[PDB]
């Protein structure tokens, strides 16, 4: 062993055949059961190069999650490439479960155990495994939810920091909990999210410090909201209990040197721009009754302005391959012998 290689991975999960939650249903027919006693072979003094930005695992995961969504969250109407696709659009139970990605016989997965690994180049503390850790396929913009935390300090990753067109992925080391609700009272499409103001402020400060560490210690770090675009990437958008939330993130991303809970106003939308492909999807009205999500903010997607002393950063996202990237960064598939 071994050699960096490409093969068709398979997925494993602890999905329950009796749960009608759609990730479970999908995973029940799509995945095999997890190993209760998973094995790890530590190669403590072996160095291996990684490139999270060129990782086929992401592409495969992307495919899988497209399949999952296309089977699980069926829109009443889909507008795509001159076609109108209509189908039964039941409101369903929707709550992501962890998915493990596994190398078939003849192959193994390399895991980087360097705790400050910037996602590209050499990794010195590597181990070999059959499967990745459980990755929750959360589809969102701006904020990464319910993901894995940095073990030590905050870590920021970019394919190329000096290139302002390349997305910056922030991995926090402390979760910031965000509670989003469509109150049942009314306006069934009116929702909101609450989170701790001071935790968020300190999170921004620590991210700012880490950004200066990268772009220069004399540089003033500023956060501004999105410059514009589709509602999905201008707002913090996500799916909570099968409903599509669009939350105004101005209060999250307006910050410079200069209440208790931050309350973000949100709308539940029925007519969505799709992440899987270019077009629209139209869903049935919000369910009455409880719509409620509590999530760990565990990461961020940022873009940098670029172009005199000051650096402005804005919330980004849109390419979900980055979301998968935020979790698969420490992995690569290899062939044994």
């Amino acid at each position: 062993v071994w050699k960096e290689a490409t093969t068709t991975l398979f997925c494993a999960s602890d999905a329950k055949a009796y749960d009608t939650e759609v990730h479970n249903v999908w995973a029940t027919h799509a995945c095999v059961p997890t190993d209760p006693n998973p094995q790890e072979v530590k190669l403590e003094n072996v160095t291996e190069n990684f490139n999270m930005w060129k990782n086929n695992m992401v592409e495969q995961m992307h495919e899988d999650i497209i399949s999952l969504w296309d089977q699980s969250l069926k829109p009443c109407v889909k507008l795509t490439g001159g076609s109108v696709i209509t189908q039964a659009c039941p409101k369903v139970s929707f709550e992501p479960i962890p998915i493990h990605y596994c190398a078939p016989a003849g192959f193994a997965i390399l895991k980087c155990n360097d705790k400050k690994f910037n996602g590209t180049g050499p990794c010195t503390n590597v181990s070999t495994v059959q499967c990745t850790h459980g990755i929750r396929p959360v589809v969102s913009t701006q904020l990464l939810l319910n993901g894995s935390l940095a073990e030590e300090e905050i870590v920021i990753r970019s394919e190329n920091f000096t290139n302002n067109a390349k997305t910056i992925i922030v991995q926090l080391n402390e979760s910031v909990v965000i509670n989003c609700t469509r109150p049942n009272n009314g306006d069934i499409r009116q929702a909101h999210c609450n989170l701790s103001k001071t935790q968020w402020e300190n999170t921004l400060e620590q991210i700012a410090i880490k950004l200066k560490e990268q772009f220069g210690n004399n540089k003033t770090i500023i956060f501004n909201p999105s410059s514009g675009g589709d509602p999905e990437i201008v707002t913090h958008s996500f799916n909570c209990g099968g409903e599509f939330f669009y939350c105004n993130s101005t209060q999250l991303f307006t910050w410079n040197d200069t209440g208790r809970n931050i309350t973000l106003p949100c709308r539940i939308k029925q007519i969505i721009n799709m992440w899987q492909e270019v077009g629209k999807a139209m869903y049935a009205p919000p369910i009455r009754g409880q719509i409620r999500c509590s999530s760990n903010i565990t990461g961020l997607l940022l873009t940098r302005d670029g172009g005199n002393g000051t650096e402005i950063f804005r919330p980004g996202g849109g390419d979900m391959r980055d979301n998968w990237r935020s979790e698969l960064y420490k992995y690569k598939v290899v062939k044994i012998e």
Partner: nanobody
Amino acid sequence: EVQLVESGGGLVQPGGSLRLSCAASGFTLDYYSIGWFRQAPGKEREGVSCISDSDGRTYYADSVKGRFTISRDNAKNTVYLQMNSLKPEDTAVYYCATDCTVDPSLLYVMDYYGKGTQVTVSS
């Protein structure tokens, strides 16, 4: 194809009235929030009015409350906005929109809308 056919509007003296209509092909309006928002050139979006669901729940921007009335004809799949007691600051382009909202902090979530109907209020 899905589309929104707007009509009505124009020019009136302050305190006059207009009626806007938006006819939707492609939906059943009572399955959506449908309504109007407005924008004047060089100015930010402003909320106006939304109608919603089977019982036709209605929502109004504070600035138009009591003056504007939104209603729905299910058979014609059409929504109407009766604009009374018009004031000069009501001058704007009114856009009929799906996923309609009147919340001042969420007006730019509306990206699926039916292009201008101009309303101008002047003496």
